[PDB]
Design a protein around this ligand. Structure first.
Ligand SMILES: Nc1nc2c(ncn2[C@@H]2O[C@H](COP(=O)(O)OP(=O)(O)OP(=O)(O)O)[C@@H](O)[C@H]2O)c(=O)[nH]1
Ligand SMILES: CN[C@@H]1CCc2c(ccc(O)c2O)[C@H]1O
Lengths: 244, 287, 55, 337
């Protein structure tokens, strides 16, 4: 009180300063780091992809070309309902990993749907969420090798499980790498176009989807992620102004 | 007659002054009052708005009466002061435009390194530097006798207090023109060319990626930005360079007309550089 | 099945029997409390400008 | 199994009829001659800035001055309401937090998040600031709310249907409350220490007893998820807010709802509910970038609080009742008097 109170204020006032400096120091580190949310269906090669990308929630930190990236994977919940998705609003992009090989496979309980159809429904639910309006998606159509073997010399046919395969005609404009049989090309392009159909339905130009084809043993995934993040930021800046 | 010419010009100069001051003060108040519009980029915009507000409040009025009266009433110290204010404002605005263009270029072409390079404290240094550079070419020679030349007709109006007019030697005119206009112009051209190339590349990539399921915006956005500035400020500097080199080629009335054409560009800047929806939302709140 | 239903069955039975009163008495009690504590509430009626700590 | 299933139906009918029998007259009919409170005007008195990211939770201290807030940047900041300066800044093990609490004694602060762990930080030692005193683990889902019965024991709610009561000294669950069919999103301790209520994603709300562990009653008025809950100061009534625009008021003794609050214009969800000291005013946050003040007795809106740039996710009232504080997804906090 009186003279005594002034005494507390100078230390307290020194005290607010001691903190503010640390907050200013931490802000510079916080701004640079880019956060990616990793999400996908069970048994879709998630651990293999995350391991090859770099040597209840799991966070992995890595750097590429003097740029810091931070990754989040939240498998603990095991929940069909999802209100933890509300938190992930500030993420730069969402990595979605889906197993293309498992078309002729059955979810264990109720025989309600094929594994792929459930993945398509999950992607549709995520894409149209109200909170995730301005967040882009990167697709890794994993298990590419198995799909070729299941299509060539395989008793199972895409026609029975997916009736629309007969009506679909593969575009001759797009071509695979040399040496691939046309049949596997038709299979993969059917798998990709199906996702793109939901992707382009209600995008409105704010957020886009980048479909990639990946396999288990590869190292070029991280470069793909870096390039896609660069493109996402460039497109966001271009749309922020009136140019695009 | 004199009634007809004086009356009509009265309805135009007043409208110009009111429009300039209203637009600039509205932009400044919108930036100052609301914390949402506070951003690193908008500091350059508010600097431009402040400079154009100063010019509209100061040079347009006194200059307007000088042509209409056909005589200058204020004394010798204020003719020089008004000339210095004019040069200061023009240079500051034109250079702030180039600063904005460079900031946009860095934001677009280097997405990852944009956040580290430009900070709140860094922008203040650039704005202070550009204002000091503008002041150096404006006040220092005008306050001194450097701007004055030796032409006979000129010696008179520097001796007589009745005629306030601008007579300069070749060196100062050329130096001021190069410092103010051409160097920012080449920079803007290169910057906008690179930015347009980047936008075209991105559009081509998106069309290749998703063309089957689904250039006017870029040309509309740039064409406006470059064309308004070029139309407003290009003729004046070229005629300013010419009239010194060639004797009696350019009449005084045409020189004054082009100078006044250059002035009106200040009013257009709030429209061009504040079309964002956030600016619209805020204006509704106060208005 | 018996394990799941019985576990509920027992529950519902526990909450089945409980004393209840008419909504009129509860409304009267709430109104009496609200009227009694009206003067002490600072939000309902602004206090002197010097009195409040923030201002 | 069918016979057991059949029983589950007869009991419901008896409870529904018994509830309908007691409806002598509606609450609105009782209070119509009562004069309205009138227009309410509130203006910001302090603005607190410094958080790097958006704000999920906050909780006033037992004193009228102290205040605590949480954010995803990983920092808990304990502010000072009167002079607007930061006393403590604490880092966090994980960057996702959804709740915070302030002990009645004023010595401990508890925080929880997506990681299925509850941390207790101790302000008393004052050597190197705060240190993690007790770590509480054992849930299978994210934590949504945490409050202190006492310095020794804490009660938490989880994304998993179970709620639990902990003992800090040993770090083990003393009692477990079960019965919900969905995620539990909010619990409030009653002024009477014995009882607390819960609200879940299932429209049902329940009242539990801490000693025995048995759900006393059940209320199922709502239509969708419940995101907030609070008690009337008397202790015999509580109010809820849901994803739909409706905010309802329940009564414990009458075992049924008494009044519903809604407006034609409003369509956004609710994220916070609180009462005044007298109990006349019901303050509710909204997904729309505003806060509305409701008159509990008259069901008539009285005023509007505006000034945030994003949705409001926290709200609380001081014990003395002088001021109300709101936190939004904008980094800033605001004190309204
Ligand atoms: N032949 C082949 N096998 C693959 C390929 N990709 C993945 N696999 C196999 O399938 C497994 C899938 O990875 P999982 O161990 O199920 O990944 P996880 O992260 O545990 O899966 P979640 O249940 O989604 O969390 C890998 O470990 C491999 O054994 C591929 O391209 N070719
Ligand atoms: C009196 N009007 C002045 C005359 C010369 C001049 C102007 C503007 C910019 C310059 O660099 C100049 O040298 C005109 O506004």
């Amino acid at each position: 009180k009186t003279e005594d109170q002034r005494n507390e204020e100078k230390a307290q006032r020194e005290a607010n300063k001691k903190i503010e400096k640390q907050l200013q120091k931490d802000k510079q580190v916080y701004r640079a780091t880019h956060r990616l949310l990793l999400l996908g269906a069970g048994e879709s090669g998630k651990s293999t992809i995350v391991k090859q990308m770099r040597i209840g929630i799991f966070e992995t930190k890595f750097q590429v070309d003097k740029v810091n990236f931070h990754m989040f994977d939240v498998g603990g919940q095991r929940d069909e309902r999802r209100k933890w998705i509300q938190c992930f609003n500030d993420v730069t992009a969402i990595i979605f990993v889906v197993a293309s090989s498992s078309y002729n496979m059955v979810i264990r309980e109720d025989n309600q749907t094929n594994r792929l159809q459930e993945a398509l429904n999950l992607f549709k639910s995520i894409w149209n969420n109200r909170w995730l309006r301005t967040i882009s998606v990167i697709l890794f159509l994993n298990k590419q090798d198995l799909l070729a073997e299941k299509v060539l010399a395989g008793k199972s046919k895409i026609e029975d499980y997916f009736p629309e395969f007969a009506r679909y005609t593969t575009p001759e404009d797009a071509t695979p790498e040399p040496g691939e049989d046309p049949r596997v090309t038709r299979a993969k392009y059917f798998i990709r176009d199906e996702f793109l159909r939901i992707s382009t339905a209600s995008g409105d130009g704010r957020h886009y989807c980048y479909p990639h084809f990946t396999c288990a043993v590869d190292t070029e995934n991280i470069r793909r992620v870096f390039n896609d993040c660069r493109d996402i930021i460039q497109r966001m800046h271009l749309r922020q102004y009136e140019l695009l | 007659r004199d009634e007809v010419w004086v009356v009509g010009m009265g309805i135009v100069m007043s409208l110009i002054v009111l429009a300039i001051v209203f637009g600039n003060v509205l932009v400044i108040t919108a930036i100052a009052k609301f914390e949402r519009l506070q951003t690193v980029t908008n500091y350059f915009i508010t600097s431009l708005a402040c400079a154009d507000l100063v010019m509209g409040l100061a040079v347009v009025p006194f200059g307007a009466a000088h042509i209409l009266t056909k005589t200058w009433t204020f004394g010798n110290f204020w003719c020089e002061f008004w000339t210095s204010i004019d040069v200061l404002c023009v240079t500051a605005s034109i250079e702030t435009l180039c600063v904005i263009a460079v900031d946009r270029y860095f934001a677009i072409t280097s997405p990852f390194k944009y956040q580290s390079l430009l900070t709140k404290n860094k922008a203040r240094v650039i704005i202070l530097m550009v204002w000091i550079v503008s002041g150096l070419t404006s006040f220092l020679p005008i306050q001194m006798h450097w701007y004055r030349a030796t032409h006979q007709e000129a010696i008179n109006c520097y001796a007589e207090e009745t005629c306030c007019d601008f007579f300069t030697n070749q060196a100062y005119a050329i130096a001021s023109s190069i410092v103010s206009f051409y160097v920012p112009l080449v920079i803007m051209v290169f910057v906008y060319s690179r930015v347009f190339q980047e936008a075209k590349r991105q559009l081509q990539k998106i069309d290749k990626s998703e063309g089957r399921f689904h250039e006017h915006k870029a040309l509309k956005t740039l064409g406006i930005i470059m064309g308004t500035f070029t139309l407003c400020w290009l003729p004046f500097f070229i005629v300013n360079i010419v009239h010194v080199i060639q004797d009696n080629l350019i009449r005084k009335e045409v020189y004054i007309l082009l100078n006044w054409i250059g002035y009106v560009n200040s009013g257009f800047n709030p429209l061009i550089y504040c079309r964002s929806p956030d600016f619209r939302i805020a204006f509704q709140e106060l208005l | 099945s018996i394990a799941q239903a019985r576990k509920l069955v027992e529950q519902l039975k526990m909450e089945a029997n409980i004393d209840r009163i008419k909504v009129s008495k509860a409304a009267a009690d709430l109104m009496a409390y609200c009227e009694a504590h009206a003067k002490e509430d600072p939000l309902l009626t602004p206090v002197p400008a010097s009195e409040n700590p923030f201002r | 199994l069918d016979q057991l299933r059949q029983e589950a139906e007869q009991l419901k009918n008896q409870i529904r009829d018994a509830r309908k029998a007691c409806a002598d007259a509606t609450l609105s009919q009782i209070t119509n001659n009562i004069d309205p409170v009138g227009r309410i005007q509130m203006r910001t008195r302090r603005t607190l800035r410094g958080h790097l990211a958006k704000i999920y939770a906050m909780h006033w201290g037992t004193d009228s001055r102290l205040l605590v807030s949480a954010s995803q940047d990983g920092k808990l900041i304990i502010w000072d309401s009167y002079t607007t300066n930061k006393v403590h800044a604490i880092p966090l093990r994980s960057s996702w937090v959804m709740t915070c609490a302030y002990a009645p004694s004023g010595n401990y602060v508890a925080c929880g998040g997506l990681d299925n762990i509850c941390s207790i930080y101790n302000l008393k030692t004052r050597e190197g600031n705060v240190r993690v005193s007790r770590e509480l683990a054992g849930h299978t889902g994210y934590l949504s709310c945490c409050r202190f019965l006492d310095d020794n024991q804490i009660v938490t709610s989880s994304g998993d249907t179970t709620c639990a009561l902990w003992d800090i000294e040993t770090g083990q669950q003393t009692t477990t409350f079960t019965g919900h069919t969905g995620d539990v999103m909010s619990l409030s301790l009653a002024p009477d220490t014995r009882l607390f209520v819960s609200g879940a994603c299932d429209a049902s709300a329940k009242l539990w007893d801490v000693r025995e562990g048995m759900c006393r009653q059940t209320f199922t008025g709502h239509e969708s998820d419940i995101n907030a809950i609070c008690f009337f100061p008397n202790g015999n009534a509580f109010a809820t807010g849901s994803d739909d625009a409706t905010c309802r008021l329940f009564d414990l003794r009458a075992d049924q709802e008494l009044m519903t609050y809604s407006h034609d214009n409003i369509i956004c969800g609710i994220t916070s509910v609180s009462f005044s000291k007298s109990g006349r005013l019901l303050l509710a946050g909204y997904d729309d970038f505003n806060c509305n003040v409701w008159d509990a007795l008259k069901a008539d809106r009285a005023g509007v609080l505006a000034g945030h740039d994003n949705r409001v996710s926290c709200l609380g009232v001081t014990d003395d009742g002088m001021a109300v504080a709101t936190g939004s997804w904008d980094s800033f906090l605001k004190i309204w008097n």
